[PDB]
Design a protein around this nucleic acid. Structure first.
Length: 40
RNA sequence: GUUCGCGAAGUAACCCUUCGUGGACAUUUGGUCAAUUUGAAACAAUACAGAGAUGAUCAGCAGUUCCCCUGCAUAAGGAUGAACCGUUUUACAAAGAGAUUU
């Protein structure tokens, strides 16, 4: 019984309460830094 | 200290030097931090066991977590990374029947 289904999810409140560490990820490097706009 | 201006001495010397004076140039660093225990690292040393499904031997991927580690990492690995199993009583009623106090 050590393996179980999921009752509820790990809430993002618990991730919003943690203070961040600055780990510059390999994909959050700046890229596609221009937003294209439509005609109007 | 350098320079500009003035005075006084050497000195009855427009040369030079000294002394005294006013100005200008120059204007507030460094420390979250003290040099062995007593403001905290963890491994290793001893000893014993020695893995999740059950009859055995195992591949795992997951989930929860007020557990993290190695990792550049949103990859991957850490025993499926580890703890998970443990207790377990009231949103509490209604109908009917008999035995009791008055």
């Amino acid at each position: 019984t050590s393996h179980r289904p999921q009752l509820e999810a790990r809430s993002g409140a618990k991730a919003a309460a943690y203070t961040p560490t600055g780990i510059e990820h390999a994909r959050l490097l700046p890229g596609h830094t221009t937003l294209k706009y439509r005609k109007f």
